[PDB]
Amino acid sequence: QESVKEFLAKAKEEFLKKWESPSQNTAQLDHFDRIKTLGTGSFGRVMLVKHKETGNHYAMKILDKQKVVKLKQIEHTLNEKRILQAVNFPFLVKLEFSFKDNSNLYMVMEYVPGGEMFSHLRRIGRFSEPHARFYAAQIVLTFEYLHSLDLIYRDLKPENLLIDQQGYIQVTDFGFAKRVKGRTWTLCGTPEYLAPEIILSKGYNKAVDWWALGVLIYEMAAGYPPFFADQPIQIYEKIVSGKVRFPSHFSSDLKDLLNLLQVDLTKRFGNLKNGVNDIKNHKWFATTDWIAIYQRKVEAPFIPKFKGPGDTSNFDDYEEEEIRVSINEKCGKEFTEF
Template structure:
């Protein structure tokens, strides 16, 4: 659904973005695929650094009514600069596609590590949860609601610290929102109830994430069940969760995050994120050292060198699609993405 109005966002652009064109890069391989296109590992011909370029089909974005989400993603990423959030270096467009030049984060998805590990020991889950909490607090202080927290959107950098990626559902929100969007297992009850909601839906999702990291699956997960069954359980709340033998402080924090009533939810009370940082489960976390990446990560990705993308799944390369990148043709959608620089000429 793309019912939010076109973005008018009073956010300061914090990141100076460069001017790029496709001819600045050599495309190496596909890192991921999605509804609108692909993410490629590329190497700059100028500074020889590796980047990830997200290529999005304008025609598909328009057809699936995702124009404002796409523009929001670009604006949000230009407005943020945080050690645990992916960097957007620049954007451009040609006749058929939009291009977003971002960090290449070589450690792959937290999801992959979690599936390989089955579940994380308490200190490991706490490390990743603490870094996510710092990133969410930063976004919320800018009045940005993230709305898509899940292990697939948390990438691991070469040093094992996180980078939150995929801001397609992020939105400037200084009050409330009401669009139904996100990943079913991670949706707060007020979202599925079509009620107005605020930034506290991100804290709810962090509760789901902590549970999934500690147990291996989200709390309401039902294999092969319809979303209706899942939504009924979410609406019912944590009373129908089966609890493994977690650390009691972890269970307490999950319950405080997954509180059905947003006005009683941790992160949304009078002290805001202060309550989260002061919770007993995080007692031994040195938040300042963590933010400065001075604490060694529990898992260091095995990376053979710059440009090693072995942590990412292998995808069949669509050479026909990449051959069409940058080809000049009629463009009926160019004016719908005014913030993406037009560099189709002289590619």
């Protein structure tokens, strides 16, 4: 459709202008009050903060430079910030500011108070097909956008999909996203969502995101992932096997679409001559109005319960640790471009 082709051509022009001249150093730490830890990992965490002059709330991702170096995440961290400052799409969390100091790297993002899709899925058990289809359509459009910019996302899982005040998705965590025109080789991603070609250490491409969409749709509609097992090595054996079992409650159209979980990447939907259109035109999506979804004109199946833009009740509790800043600069060379 020409209107879609023209939209994507403008989207790539605007991305490239920011990609080639990235913003830097657009805030500082003492402009914000720290409120609460929203999540934690091996080299970073995310904290709710409030801007002291405007009163606006944000989610601030804080990375310790020395730990980034030690866990071999330098390039990944530079990818994350350079991509986030350049993209713009209705279903991607927005980067508002970025900066660094002697000790840390900071990405200040919009705060989405409805919490992770993962929490809501585990509460209710499983989503109906219409409810799963509403979220899946947003991921299909987001991947069409990212792939047209030559970006692979590589971290799709329910924990990275936040639910906003209108019940739509905001994708967060660009820590494994990368600009790739051909193949790439890094081992990364959560075990249950890895495509076979990642597990087998091959040069892989954007088809790994369409595989991960198949895992996400199965998990939303079943309540558990298709290759579940107790330990990673057992998960990986099931992934490479070519076999999947579907619950009897799945529709025949859903089973047929889940062409996404095709072990041969050269036969996988999203990676054929018609690209994303094989997914968008599949019978499981026959009731989906793609333009209305993009315009946020569809009524969502679920509106999260929260009291206001500072409420943290849809996130969980972590031990609260200091944000320390050394008097000496650490790892200045490695992070020059941030």
